[PDB]
């Protein structure tokens, strides 16, 4: 279910395969919208800037709770620097999502390269992408919190 | 004076360039240096990603003092909207560097091609780009405090 929004149906199925796979979390999507400055806040996030005929971004903020949770999914309990490892972690899956979800958009005639991806941490934090276009934004939720999944290009 | 990172050239050029003629603001390069998992910490940054043969990051991270100078330097004192000005303002800014840095690297036989900025903004927040690489930082000054503008590829 996607809203009309025919460019969520990638980034929903990337979301849901990365963090199947890598975390053992089948996350639940929740409602895509479109909308002109749209801001994401969290506590932990990752930023990926797309290139191509059209420029713009991939970013997913996590709330701590749920970002704490996918890094042990992800790694075990068996984890040591917290700190490395969730930005290791949110890095990773932020990237295979950016890959993923570059995949779909690229057999729905839509090329973008993508680039290694920034990490931002700070409780409550804001990210807002800066173009002309409106900006998609899908919620989604796990048993230990939610994080938003954004795309943009102009 | 690059301290043996000649890769600081353009983005010390670009940096003056575009805050000198967008803000009136001549910022102070302090020492480039490398440093893998480097981490900018300030109040608001914006990130770009880039790609191309190789793929990476550009950010810039100030802070809120810094910004503030910043935005009235680029709009002036007639500014209402302080919150979307900061946004925007530092988003054209880094947008501006990343375009002169990547002409100057371009030169230098390095071709990226760079996305559209994303604005983070929270106090005491940090970026961390994930690379394999080490991570090229240039603090700056100017009269109203500090930021740090980042450069990575791998």
Same mark, same amino acid.
């Given at each position: 279910?996607?809203?009309?929004?025919?460019?969520?149906? =990638?980034?929903?199925? !990337?979301?849901?395969?990365?963090?199947?796979?890598? !975390? &053992?979390?089948? =996350?639940? +999507?929740?409602? +895509?919208?479109?909308?002109?400055?749209?801001?994401?806040?969290? #506590?932990?996030? %990752?930023?990926? &800037?797309?290139?191509?005929?059209?420029?713009?971004?991939?970013?997913?903020?996590?709330?701590?709770? @749920? %970002?704490? !949770?996918?890094?042990?999914?992800?790694?075990? #309990?068996?984890?040591?620097?917290?700190?490395? #490892?969730?930005?290791?972690?949110?890095?990773?899956?932020?990237?295979?999502?950016? &890959?993923? %979800?570059? %995949?779909?958009?690229? /057999?729905?005639?839509?090329?973008?390269?993508?680039?290694? +991806?920034?990490?931002?941490?700070?409780?409550? $934090?804001?990210?807002? $992408?800066?173009?002309?276009? =409106?900006?998609?934004?899908? +919620?989604?939720?796990?048993? $230990?919190? /939610? *994080?938003?999944?954004? *795309? @943009?290009? /102009?």
């Amino acid at each position: 279910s996607v809203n009309g929004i025919e460019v969520a149906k =990638p980034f929903i199925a !990337a979301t849901v395969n990365v963090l199947s796979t890598m !975390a &053992g979390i089948q =996350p639940q +999507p929740g409602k +895509p919208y479109v909308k002109k400055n749209n801001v994401a806040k969290g #506590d932990v996030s %990752a930023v990926i &800037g797309i290139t191509g005929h059209k420029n713009g971004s991939i970013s997913v903020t996590f709330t701590k709770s @749920c %970002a704490i !949770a996918l890094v042990k999914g992800m790694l075990g #309990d068996d984890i040591q620097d917290i700190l490395q #490892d969730t930005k290791d972690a949110v890095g990773e899956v932020t990237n295979m999502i950016s &890959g993923q %979800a570059r %995949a779909g958009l690229a /057999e729905m005639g839509m090329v973008f390269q993508g680039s290694t +991806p920034s990490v931002i941490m700070g409780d409550g $934090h804001t990210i807002s $992408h800066v173009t002309k276009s =409106p900006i998609m934004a899908i +919620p989604f939720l796990t048993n $230990h919190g /939610e *994080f938003t999944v954004e *795309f @943009c290009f /102009e």
